[PDB]
Specification:
The structure is a homotrimer. With 119 residues, chain A is of the alpha+beta class. Chain A has a single domain, classed as 2-Layer Sandwich (60s Ribosomal Protein L30, Chain: A), CATH 3.30.1330.40. Helices cover 24% and strands 32% of the residues of chain A. In chain A, 50% of the residues are buried. Chains in contact: A-B, A-C, B-C.
Chain lengths: 119, 117, 119
Amino acid sequence: HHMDIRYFGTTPRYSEAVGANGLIFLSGMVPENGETAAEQTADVLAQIDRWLAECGSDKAHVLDAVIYLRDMGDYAEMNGVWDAWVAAGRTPARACVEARLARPEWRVEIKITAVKRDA
Amino acid sequence: HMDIRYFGTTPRYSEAVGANGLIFLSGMVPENGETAAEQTADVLAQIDRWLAECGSDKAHVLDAVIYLRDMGDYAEMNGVWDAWVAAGRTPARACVEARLARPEWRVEIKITAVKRD
Amino acid sequence: HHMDIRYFGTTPRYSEAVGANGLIFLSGMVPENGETAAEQTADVLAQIDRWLAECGSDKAHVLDAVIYLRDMGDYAEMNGVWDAWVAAGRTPARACVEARLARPEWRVEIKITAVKRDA
């Protein structure tokens, strides 16, 4: 019935996206490209775009975002990219905290909750 | 069915976001106070404000994530928290140590709630 | 009554599990047994199994998991336990970040969101 789960980008460890009754949970997305906070933030947001598309959602349908930075010194730099990317008038619940990530060179990780668009 | 309402929207985030009975609040950070207890009170008072605005309250919080700058403030935060929570209807909770956007912020609380029917 | 809340393992501070409209929110599960990351992860995951079962769910119906490690040096050791525990083909959205926990001896805390299986 309506609690049925769908899985996207499944690995032995995690799925990139998981969806159930209209809600969408993305794995924490980490940089695949870039060195600077801005470069890495851009790459992470592009991944999010790609995975939200796969789930029948998009950034204008993000409910919540938690942003983990390795170093809170990168706040303004991250924000500059985030601010340009978010859907205006439809910006999500957000929290930003300092936490070290699985690799030392990762400066940002963003964890998204979103909703599947109604047809 | 999956329609979204945004509350207190800024260019960067909204304070509250509702979809299909669920409410997601932004991390609420202190606007008043210096000590962990004073800041926890202020954070919780904001949560109350945004909850009420969204047709919810503290007795309909599902989940709370508490970030402290310093886990040494654990007892101090809890004292304020324990007094505030709706008795018999206390949420899923996790409390972890993480630094916040401003150095003087000792506490940030992130809430998921339900809109009362 | 569509959004009725059910509470499980309610203390004056928190409930171990909270359910509403099919979704399950577990409190951060912390180790009650074990010293090493491996030992503590298993204990944490054993708790999760228990509470998910109490809420009419299981590990194959976990939507999301946030894993906090005291020390990111424990990443491989935790993943070892995680990888064997997770339901193959049904692995959840995951994020792993470094954060100190309530007690210094605690090396892992896992926070789960899941769905109540249909009848």
